[PDB]
Amino acid sequence: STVDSIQSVLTTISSILSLKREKPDNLAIILQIDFTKLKEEDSLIVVYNSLKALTIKFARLQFCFVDRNNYVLDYGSVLHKIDSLDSISNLKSKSSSTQFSPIWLKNTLYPENIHEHLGIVAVSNSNMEAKKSILFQDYRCFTSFGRRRPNELKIKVGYLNVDYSDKIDELVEASSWTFVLETLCYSFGLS
Amino acid sequence: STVDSIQSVLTTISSILSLKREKPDNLAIILQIDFTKLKEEDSLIVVYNSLKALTIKFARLQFCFVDRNNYVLDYGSVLHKIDSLDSISNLKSKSSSTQFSPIWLKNTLYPENIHEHLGIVAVSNSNMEAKKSILFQDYRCFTSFGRRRPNELKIKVGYLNVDYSDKIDELVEASSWTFVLETLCYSFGLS
């Protein structure tokens, strides 16, 4: 926990720096939320602010809200599709029959493919059942010609007592949607 | 490179901290050396000092020198088997027909098994051909009951332009046998 403290920043800072060196022209943020896991819900008001904030640097900022069972709740442009906090809030009470996957996301966000530099950020606070977690998934359908892996950042909100080092790969562990998204903003010189 | 600077410390510090939280009772340091890659050979005098230094905290400190083709050059107790710097130096000119592997090392260092807490440190500056590199190997023959992976630290001396994220796993990249071993000493409160 003290050690969980230190590595959160050390690892969050370090991996976000990896995201940055590939020089993304855009970012796609997939957020998988177990709403009944939020300590305080004013953790959802930081998400909103963080998201809009990121669109100062990335106007074409893309987002995707998955639920705790891996069902897509929404997606599209943060800039144009997120006006209220209701915007984020309402999805709590939103039904869906579409399972998430990178290859869905890719097909859905980029029909004509990817020519720009894209960075993928996967953040989830839901339980680590392999079939439901977005972190456990294979984002390599996003690999560019001449990289052998994508520019993928995978963060887990809420510390783990279990090792998934074989199944997942350079996963980060922080304690808040608040530490994560905010750090992510600081990292781009954002407010 | 500036970024290679920052992540070296950030990642070295962070992963060495992981080594530390498992609370090792002992350490085994495998050092794979391409001697014709050393910029300055007084990089071999730090190895010597670093090794002896570590035996202040770990008297039962075990070491293993592999060569650039994955042949064991020597092994045993740092404390009792390393007197000269010749000790380390001579192995330059030492022949061998034993390929290295964890399972050899395990069998050789621990015939009766492992009951203590052991930390494994693999440091290599040799080229990344999978069959010759010690970092590319599977150290899980060292996993304890109730951990699902070993306490393994794998450091690569000399930065890489290539991604081996699938084959190797939470590899660290530093620039010196000097930064690495010294940091490793600082980490245990050593001089």
Side-chain angles (χ1 to χ4, degrees):
Chain A
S1 174
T2 286
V3 39
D4 285 3
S5 271
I6 98 120
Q7 328 231 63
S8 304
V9 345
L10 282 185
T11 68
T12 297
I13 285 174
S14 180
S15 48
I16 290 178
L17 183 65
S18 299
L19 181 70
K20 284 164 75 174
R21 64 201 296 190
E22 315 302 350
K23 307 172 175 178
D25 296 293
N26 205 39
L27 246 58
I29 329 282
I30 303 76
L31 303 155
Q32 176 189 29
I33 302 171
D34 189 321
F35 292 99
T36 65
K37 249 197 199 317
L38 286 125
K39 208 218 79 164
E40 63 197 10
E41 184 105 343
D42 56 332
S43 295
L44 188 21
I45 311 167
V46 159
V47 171
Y48 174 74
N49 305 324
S50 288
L51 282 181
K52 303 300 276 188
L54 275 300
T55 60
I56 298 170
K57 167 163 251 307
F58 309 100
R60 282 174 297 108
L61 188 25
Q62 298 297 288
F63 70 86
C64 180
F65 296 103
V66 190
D67 78 8
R68 59 176 182 183
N69 301 288
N70 201 71
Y71 289 95
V72 186
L73 293 182
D74 196 19
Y75 83 90
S77 168
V78 181
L79 172 58
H80 307 119
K81 229 178 291 195
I82 297 181
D83 61 356
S84 317
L85 165 42
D86 300 272
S87 285
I88 283 104
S89 186
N90 298 156
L91 302 166
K92 189 176 310 176
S93 36
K94 161 69 173 180
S95 61
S96 163
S97 295
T98 306
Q99 280 287 288
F100 172 92
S101 72
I103 320 66
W104 171 83
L105 187 80
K106 172 154 160 45
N107 284 350
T108 291
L109 275 303
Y110 303 92
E112 312 259 328
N113 273 13
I114 299 85
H115 292 83
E116 64 186 356
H117 292 88
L118 187 66
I120 317 299
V121 187
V123 198
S124 155
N125 74 340
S126 74
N127 279 68
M128 296 293 291
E129 183 65 13
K131 309 182 67 177
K132 285 131 170 293
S133 173
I134 64 163
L135 295 48
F136 271 103
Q137 297 179 25
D138 191 344
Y139 293 87
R140 292 173 296 180
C141 75
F142 271 102
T143 318
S144 295
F145 160 83
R147 305 266 175 257
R148 53 192 307 286
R149 142 175 276 87
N151 198 6
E152 63 185 342
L153 178 71
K154 302 184 198 188
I155 302 174
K156 167 60 176 101
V157 185
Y159 310 119
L160 295 55
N161 263 256
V162 171
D163 192 332
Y164 307 79
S165 293
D166 35 31
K167 292 182 292 297
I168 288 172
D169 45 74
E170 290 205 9
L171 175 59
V172 177
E173 304 181 38
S175 54
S176 342
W177 287 97
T178 311
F179 177 83
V180 187
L181 293 182
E182 290 195 1
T183 300
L184 192 61
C185 298
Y186 290 134
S187 293
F188 289 107
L190 260 347
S191 18
Chain B
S1 174
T2 286
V3 39
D4 285 3
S5 271
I6 98 120
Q7 328 231 63
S8 304
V9 345
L10 282 185
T11 68
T12 297
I13 285 174
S14 180
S15 48
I16 290 178
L17 183 65
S18 299
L19 181 70
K20 284 164 75 174
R21 64 201 296 190
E22 315 302 350
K23 307 172 175 178
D25 296 293
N26 205 39
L27 246 58
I29 329 282
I30 303 76
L31 303 155
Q32 176 189 29
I33 302 171
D34 189 321
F35 292 99
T36 65
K37 249 197 199 317
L38 286 125
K39 208 218 79 164
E40 63 197 10
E41 184 105 343
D42 56 332
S43 295
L44 188 21
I45 311 167
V46 159
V47 171
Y48 174 74
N49 305 324
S50 288
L51 282 181
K52 303 300 276 188
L54 275 300
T55 60
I56 298 170
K57 167 163 251 307
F58 309 100
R60 282 174 297 108
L61 188 25
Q62 298 297 288
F63 70 86
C64 180
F65 296 103
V66 190
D67 78 8
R68 59 176 182 183
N69 301 288
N70 201 71
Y71 289 95
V72 186
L73 293 182
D74 196 19
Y75 83 90
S77 168
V78 181
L79 172 58
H80 307 119
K81 229 178 291 195
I82 297 181
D83 61 356
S84 317
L85 165 42
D86 300 272
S87 285
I88 283 104
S89 186
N90 298 156
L91 302 166
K92 189 176 310 176
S93 36
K94 161 69 173 180
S95 61
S96 163
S97 295
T98 306
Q99 280 287 288
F100 172 92
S101 72
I103 320 66
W104 171 83
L105 187 80
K106 172 154 160 45
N107 284 350
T108 291
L109 275 303
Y110 303 92
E112 312 259 328
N113 273 13
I114 299 85
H115 292 83
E116 64 186 356
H117 292 88
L118 187 66
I120 317 299
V121 187
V123 198
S124 155
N125 74 340
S126 74
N127 279 68
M128 296 293 291
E129 183 65 13
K131 309 182 67 177
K132 285 131 170 293
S133 173
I134 64 163
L135 295 48
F136 271 103
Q137 297 179 25
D138 191 344
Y139 293 87
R140 292 173 296 180
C141 75
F142 271 102
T143 318
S144 295
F145 160 83
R147 305 266 175 257
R148 53 192 307 286
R149 142 175 276 87
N151 198 6
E152 63 185 342
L153 178 71
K154 302 184 198 188
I155 302 174
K156 167 60 176 101
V157 185
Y159 310 119
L160 295 55
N161 263 256
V162 171
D163 192 332
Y164 307 79
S165 293
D166 35 31
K167 292 182 292 297
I168 288 172
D169 45 74
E170 290 205 9
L171 175 59
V172 177
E173 304 181 38
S175 54
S176 342
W177 287 97
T178 311
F179 177 83
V180 187
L181 293 182
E182 290 195 1
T183 300
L184 192 61
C185 298
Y186 290 134
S187 293
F188 289 107
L190 260 347
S191 18

